Structure formats: C-alpha cells, structure tokens
Design a protein around this motif. Structure first.
Motif, PDB file in Angstrom:
ATOM      1  N   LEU A 156       0.819  -1.206   0.000  1.00 20.47           N
ATOM      2  CA  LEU A 156       0.000   0.000   0.000  1.00 20.47           C
ATOM      3  C   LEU A 156       0.855   1.260   0.000  1.00 20.47           C
ATOM      4  O   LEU A 156       0.381   2.349   0.328  1.00 20.47           O
ATOM      5  N   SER A 157       2.120   1.101  -0.378  1.00 15.98           N
ATOM      6  CA  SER A 157       3.000   2.236  -0.616  1.00 15.98           C
ATOM      7  C   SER A 157       2.534   2.982  -1.865  1.00 15.98           C
ATOM      8  O   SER A 157       1.616   2.536  -2.551  1.00 15.98           O
ATOM      9  N   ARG A 158       3.173   4.111  -2.155  1.00 16.11           N
ATOM     10  CA  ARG A 158       2.740   4.996  -3.237  1.00 16.11           C
ATOM     11  C   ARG A 158       2.599   4.299  -4.592  1.00 16.11           C
ATOM     12  O   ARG A 158       1.620   4.510  -5.309  1.00 16.11           O
ATOM     13  N   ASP A 159       3.573   3.462  -4.936  1.00 11.03           N
ATOM     14  CA  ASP A 159       3.576   2.807  -6.240  1.00 11.03           C
ATOM     15  C   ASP A 159       2.679   1.566  -6.298  1.00 11.03           C
ATOM     16  O   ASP A 159       1.972   1.352  -7.283  1.00 11.03           O
ATOM     17  N   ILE A 164      -2.742  -2.249  -6.739  1.00  6.67           N
ATOM     18  CA  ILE A 164      -3.783  -2.870  -5.925  1.00  6.67           C
ATOM     19  C   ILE A 164      -5.180  -2.375  -6.311  1.00  6.67           C
ATOM     20  O   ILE A 164      -6.125  -3.162  -6.384  1.00  6.67           O
ATOM     21  N   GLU A 165      -5.305  -1.075  -6.566  1.00  8.40           N
ATOM     22  CA  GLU A 165      -6.577  -0.507  -7.008  1.00  8.40           C
ATOM     23  C   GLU A 165      -6.991  -1.079  -8.365  1.00  8.40           C
ATOM     24  O   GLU A 165      -8.161  -1.434  -8.580  1.00  8.40           O
ATOM     25  N   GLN A 166      -6.021  -1.175  -9.272  1.00  8.16           N
ATOM     26  CA  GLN A 166      -6.259  -1.753 -10.591  1.00  8.16           C
ATOM     27  C   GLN A 166      -6.735  -3.200 -10.497  1.00  8.16           C
ATOM     28  O   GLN A 166      -7.658  -3.600 -11.203  1.00  8.16           O
ATOM     29  N   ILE A 167      -6.100  -3.978  -9.625  1.00  4.40           N
ATOM     30  CA  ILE A 167      -6.502  -5.361  -9.390  1.00  4.40           C
ATOM     31  C   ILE A 167      -7.911  -5.408  -8.809  1.00  4.40           C
ATOM     32  O   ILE A 167      -8.724  -6.255  -9.184  1.00  4.40           O
ATOM     33  N   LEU A 168      -8.201  -4.482  -7.902  1.00  2.49           N
ATOM     34  CA  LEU A 168      -9.508  -4.420  -7.258  1.00  2.49           C
ATOM     35  C   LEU A 168     -10.616  -4.096  -8.252  1.00  2.49           C
ATOM     36  O   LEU A 168     -11.768  -4.492  -8.056  1.00  2.49           O
ATOM     37  N   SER A 169     -10.265  -3.383  -9.319  1.00  6.35           N
ATOM     38  CA  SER A 169     -11.240  -3.045 -10.356  1.00  6.35           C
ATOM     39  C   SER A 169     -11.859  -4.280 -11.026  1.00  6.35           C
ATOM     40  O   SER A 169     -12.959  -4.205 -11.576  1.00  6.35           O
ATOM     41  N   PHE A 170     -11.155  -5.409 -10.972  1.00  9.11           N
ATOM     42  CA  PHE A 170     -11.619  -6.643 -11.610  1.00  9.11           C
ATOM     43  C   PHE A 170     -12.592  -7.453 -10.752  1.00  9.11           C
ATOM     44  O   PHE A 170     -13.393  -8.226 -11.275  1.00  9.11           O
ATOM     45  N   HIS A 175     -17.663  -7.385  -2.582  1.00  3.54           N
ATOM     46  CA  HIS A 175     -16.660  -8.382  -2.237  1.00  3.54           C
ATOM     47  C   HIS A 175     -16.093  -8.135  -0.846  1.00  3.54           C
ATOM     48  O   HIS A 175     -15.934  -6.991  -0.420  1.00  3.54           O
ATOM     49  N   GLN A 176     -15.788  -9.222  -0.145  1.00  2.45           N
ATOM     50  CA  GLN A 176     -15.234  -9.140   1.201  1.00  2.45           C
ATOM     51  C   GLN A 176     -13.732  -8.882   1.148  1.00  2.45           C
ATOM     52  O   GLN A 176     -13.029  -9.438   0.304  1.00  2.45           O
ATOM     53  N   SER A 177     -13.244  -8.035   2.049  1.00  2.00           N
ATOM     54  CA  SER A 177     -11.825  -7.700   2.086  1.00  2.00           C
ATOM     55  C   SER A 177     -11.217  -7.936   3.466  1.00  2.00           C
ATOM     56  O   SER A 177     -11.688  -7.391   4.465  1.00  2.00           O
ATOM     57  N   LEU A 178     -10.169  -8.756   3.511  1.00  2.00           N
ATOM     58  CA  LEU A 178      -9.457  -9.036   4.751  1.00  2.00           C
ATOM     59  C   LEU A 178      -8.031  -8.505   4.664  1.00  2.00           C
ATOM     60  O   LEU A 178      -7.206  -9.047   3.929  1.00  2.00           O
ATOM     61  N   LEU A 179      -7.745  -7.447   5.415  1.00  2.00           N
ATOM     62  CA  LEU A 179      -6.425  -6.818   5.387  1.00  2.00           C
ATOM     63  C   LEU A 179      -5.612  -7.114   6.646  1.00  2.00           C
ATOM     64  O   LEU A 179      -6.092  -6.933   7.763  1.00  2.00           O
ATOM     65  N   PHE A 180      -4.375  -7.565   6.458  1.00  2.00           N
ATOM     66  CA  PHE A 180      -3.507  -7.924   7.577  1.00  2.00           C
ATOM     67  C   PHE A 180      -2.159  -7.210   7.510  1.00  2.00           C
ATOM     68  O   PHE A 180      -1.577  -7.055   6.436  1.00  2.00           O
ATOM     69  N   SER A 181      -1.672  -6.779   8.668  1.00  2.00           N
ATOM     70  CA  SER A 181      -0.388  -6.095   8.763  1.00  2.00           C
ATOM     71  C   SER A 181       0.227  -6.286  10.147  1.00  2.00           C
ATOM     72  O   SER A 181      -0.460  -6.662  11.095  1.00  2.00           O
ATOM     73  N   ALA A 182       1.539  -6.109  10.237  1.00  2.00           N
ATOM     74  CA  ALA A 182       2.230  -6.180  11.513  1.00  2.00           C
ATOM     75  C   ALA A 182       2.663  -4.803  11.995  1.00  2.00           C
ATOM     76  O   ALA A 182       3.143  -4.655  13.109  1.00  2.00           O
ATOM     77  N   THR A 183       2.523  -3.802  11.138  1.00  2.00           N
ATOM     78  CA  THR A 183       2.794  -2.423  11.525  1.00  2.00           C
ATOM     79  C   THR A 183       1.558  -1.575  11.306  1.00  2.00           C
ATOM     80  O   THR A 183       0.913  -1.670  10.274  1.00  2.00           O
ATOM     81  N   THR A 187      -0.426   3.991   4.544  1.00  2.00           N
ATOM     82  CA  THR A 187      -0.202   5.215   3.779  1.00  2.00           C
ATOM     83  C   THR A 187      -1.447   6.001   3.363  1.00  2.00           C
ATOM     84  O   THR A 187      -1.445   7.234   3.407  1.00  2.00           O
ATOM     85  N   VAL A 188      -2.497   5.300   2.940  1.00  2.00           N
ATOM     86  CA  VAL A 188      -3.666   5.972   2.367  1.00  2.00           C
ATOM     87  C   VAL A 188      -4.968   5.764   3.134  1.00  2.00           C
ATOM     88  O   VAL A 188      -5.372   4.638   3.400  1.00  2.00           O
ATOM     89  N   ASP A 189      -5.633   6.867   3.455  1.00  3.95           N
ATOM     90  CA  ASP A 189      -6.893   6.827   4.181  1.00  3.95           C
ATOM     91  C   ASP A 189      -8.127   6.656   3.298  1.00  3.95           C
ATOM     92  O   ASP A 189      -9.083   5.959   3.666  1.00  3.95           O
ATOM     93  N   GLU A 190      -8.136   7.356   2.169  1.00  4.36           N
ATOM     94  CA  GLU A 190      -9.181   7.194   1.166  1.00  4.36           C
ATOM     95  C   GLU A 190      -9.249   5.769   0.627  1.00  4.36           C
ATOM     96  O   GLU A 190     -10.338   5.272   0.356  1.00  4.36           O
ATOM     97  N   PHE A 191      -8.092   5.129   0.458  1.00  2.77           N
ATOM     98  CA  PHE A 191      -8.039   3.748  -0.015  1.00  2.77           C
ATOM     99  C   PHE A 191      -8.896   2.873   0.881  1.00  2.77           C
ATOM    100  O   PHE A 191      -9.721   2.090   0.403  1.00  2.77           O
ATOM    101  N   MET A 192      -8.709   3.025   2.186  1.00  4.64           N
ATOM    102  CA  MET A 192      -9.443   2.226   3.149  1.00  4.64           C
ATOM    103  C   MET A 192     -10.901   2.650   3.274  1.00  4.64           C
ATOM    104  O   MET A 192     -11.776   1.797   3.413  1.00  4.64           O
ATOM    105  N   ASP A 193     -11.183   3.950   3.223  1.00  4.57           N
ATOM    106  CA  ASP A 193     -12.588   4.346   3.312  1.00  4.57           C
ATOM    107  C   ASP A 193     -13.387   3.878   2.094  1.00  4.57           C
ATOM    108  O   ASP A 193     -14.580   3.595   2.198  1.00  4.57           O
TER     109      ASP A 193
END
Lengths: 376, 30
Positions: A156-159, A164-170, A175-183, A187-193
């Motif tokens: 979810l870095s700038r590049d 990821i957005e392009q992939i999501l377009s398909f 659709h259900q989304s499960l996001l996992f991270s250790a930190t 980077t992006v708030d609009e992405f998540m909203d």
C-alpha cells in the motif's frame, strides 16, 4: 474454545486437526468468526502460521469446491510468502477438494497462463504478476468475492497502491476484504474508506512501529560483546543511545564497565523503585548524559527523539519485547539505528522476530551511512 | 563492580561477558 465452535465443515476441521491445531489463538478467535459472517476485516497482528491460518480457514470455509472459478485472491508482497501461504492453504484444505495456485514475478508467464486454464479456486500472488494476468483476462475474477492482503503495508505504498486498485477493479463490486499487517501505519486513508466497508478492526499488537529505523545485527560471542560495543561507541555518531540487557545484574555490570571505559551513562531496571526510575528517565530525557542502560521495563513513557541509536546488548526472546524496545509511537518514521548483538543461541530468535514483525534485520555493514540516523 | 542481586536465568553466563580476560578496545571486526 475449540475450532468446532466455529461451525466449519467436516473436511476443514479434518485439515485443521491434521495440522495439530487444537485451541484457536487470539487472532483466530477474533478473525475466523467475523470473516465467515462476510464482514470486512482490518487486523494488526504479528506474522505467523496461526495468523495465515486465521485468514486461510475462513477462505476454505467460504470457497465452494463445486465452482471451478477463482473465489478468493490472496495478495502478498514476496514470492516466499506466496509459497508459504499456499502451503498453508493446501495443508489445511487437504480434504476440501480445493485447488490453490501461486503466481509471482519470479516464475514464467507461459506456465501460469497454461495453469490458469485448469481449475483454480484460490489464487496467491504478487501485485505485478496478478494485475498482469488479470489485464490479459487469463485470470477470471468475476466470482472472486473474497480479497485478502497479507503484509498489506508492503503493498500500500505509493507505487503499489495503484496496482492494488487496478486489481480491485476486476473483482465484483460486492466483495469481502481481509487486510492484515504487523505495523499500524498505513499510507492511504481514502483507499481504506473506499475499499473497506464497515470493517471489523483487530489490534493484537502494542501501538508501536519500526518505521524509519534501520536495523542491523552482529554475530558476537559473549566474551566479545564489550569489545564490539566500544567499537560501535567510537564508530557511530551517537546523539543519545539506550542499551538493553536481559537482566538487572547485567544492566549494572554493563553500566559499571561503560563508566570505567571513559563514558557517561545512567542505568534503570526493575529492582529499583518507580520514583528512582522516573528520576533516571527524566534526567536522561533532559540530555544529562549520552547513554542509558535499561532492563525490560513496562510502562514506557514518552518518546525521546534525541535517542538515535538503540543497542540490544542482549537480544530479546519475543517480538513483543523487541518492538517494546525499538518501536516508536509516531505514525511517521524515526531516523535512527537499532543494533542487535547476536550470539549463537540467539540466531533462531533473530529469524523468528524478523519474520513476526515483518521487518528487516540485515548484517551490519563495514561503514554505516550517516543519512540513516543523523538528522539536520 | 556491583551486581549482587538475586540471580536470574541470563546471569548464568555473565562470567563469559564480564570476565577479566574479556577483550576490550575499538578493534572489533565485522
């Protein structure tokens, strides 16, 4: 209490049983039931097989084996993690009659395109290759109602976010989304909203991040530790440093040896009273000395930005402790160093922790760049 | 030096680290 408490199908329970899992871990207790509901998830937890299972188990429950289409997409940043993830999938989904495929930037496109003509229920891949296969329409995602990102922060870095957005377009709109991270920082708030819908949040880690901190290790025998430490003390442009030890006694001994070495420092540990510790902390915070030697102390206070080098004289056993020592609270990074002294018996824990926190602890180079810990 | 608290697990090898024969300097090679 048990995995049967989640009302999973027989074959899935068989797979879980064969893997040696009897009692569901906290990440599984939190993520499995919610994911089966269909609700989105945004989770922060240290990496493990149990976490990967915390998302794979719901995937195997939801995916219909009779439908020969990609029903779940698992995005990972590295090929190693792709392999590991798919291994977990195939293991737990042994009796499910479910097909799983890895596609990464490493492998050749031809073989994967050929493989996609066969049945694939779950697709594990890296952003580039997956977007490529999706654009070429080799991978049909019209029924991919489940979307998963492990180590999501790395994608979810700038590049990568664009990809990821392009992939999501398909994927289908619903659709259900499960996001996992250790930190925690993302980077992006609009992405998540935009892409997460009423997500269920899980926070099983301490609120700290290793962002901006450059981490090195050094193979060092106990007898050589002091030597190496002093060498660092001359090599590095330390502003303020904190040295961590695994016991109070070692804290005091190291402090004494440091003072006799011709260096100024304080020391704080668990055997002291809270007042004394607060005094030492406040004094060090005002920049009275240059070095501080601590044992593990709970209730850490307020970040000290002067501290630009942290040294693990003794390498800790858990990732929780490592993060509690090194991590900062700022959502923005911190320009600083973390140097770990690794003996033989520490080697495994060097690997494990590095895997669990999703970070990088490389071998200390000949000369350390000053741009990494010195600010202007 | 001063330690002399109720010993704990990782103190068992302190003699290796803080021994009289333990080398000190700025020599250390990586």
């Amino acid at each position: 209490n048990t995995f049967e408490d989640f009302y999973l199908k027989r074959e899935l329970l068989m797979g879980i049983f064969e893997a040696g899992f009897e009692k569901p871990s906290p990440i599984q207790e939190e993520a499995i039931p919610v994911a089966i509901t269909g609700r989105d998830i945004l989770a922060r937890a240290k990496n493990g097989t149990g976490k990967t299972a915390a998302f794979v188990i719901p995937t195997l429950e939801k995916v219909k084996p009779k439908l020969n289409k990609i029903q779940a997409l698992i995005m990972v940043p590295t090929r190693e993690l792709a392999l590991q993830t798919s291994q977990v999938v195939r293991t737990l989904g042994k009796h499910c009659g479910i097909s799983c495929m890895v596609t990464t930037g490493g492998t050749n496109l031809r073989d994967d395109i050929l493989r996609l003509n066969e049945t694939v229920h779950i697709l594990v891949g890296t952003p580039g290759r997956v977007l490529d296969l999706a654009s070429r329409k080799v991978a049909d995602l019209s029924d991919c109602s489940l979307f998963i990102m492990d180590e999501a922060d790395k994608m979810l870095s700038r590049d990568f976010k664009t990809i990821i957005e392009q992939i999501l377009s398909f994927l289908p709109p619903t659709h259900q989304s499960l996001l996992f991270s250790a930190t925690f920082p993302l980077t992006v708030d609009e992405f998540m909203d935009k892409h997460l819908h009423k997500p269920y949040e899980i926070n099983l880690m301490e609120e700290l991040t290793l962002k901006g901190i450059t981490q090195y290790y050094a193979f060092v025998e106990e007898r050589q530790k002091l030597h190496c430490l002093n060498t660092l003390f001359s090599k590095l442009q330390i502003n303020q440093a904190i040295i961590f030890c695994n016991s109070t006694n070692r804290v005091e001994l190291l402090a004494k040896k440091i003072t006799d070495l011709g260096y100024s420092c304080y020391y704080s540990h668990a055997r002291m009273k809270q007042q004394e510790r607060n005094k030492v902390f406040h004094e060090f915070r005002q920049g009275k000395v240059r070095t501080l030697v601590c044992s593990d102390l709970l209730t850490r206070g307020i970040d000290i930005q002067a501290v630009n080098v942290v040294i693990n004289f003794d390498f800790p056993k858990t990732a929780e402790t490592y993060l509690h020592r090194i991590g900062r609270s700022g959502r923005f990074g911190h320009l600083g160093l973390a140097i770990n002294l690794i003996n033989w018996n520490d080697r495994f824990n060097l690997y494990k922790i590095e895997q669990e926190l999703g970070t990088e602890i490389a071998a200390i180079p000949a000369t350390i760049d000053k741009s990494l810990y010195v600010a202007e | 030096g001063y330690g002399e608290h109720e010993l704990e697990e990782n103190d068992y090898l302190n003699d290796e680290t803080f021994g009289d024969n333990v080398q000190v300097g700025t020599d250390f090679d990586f």
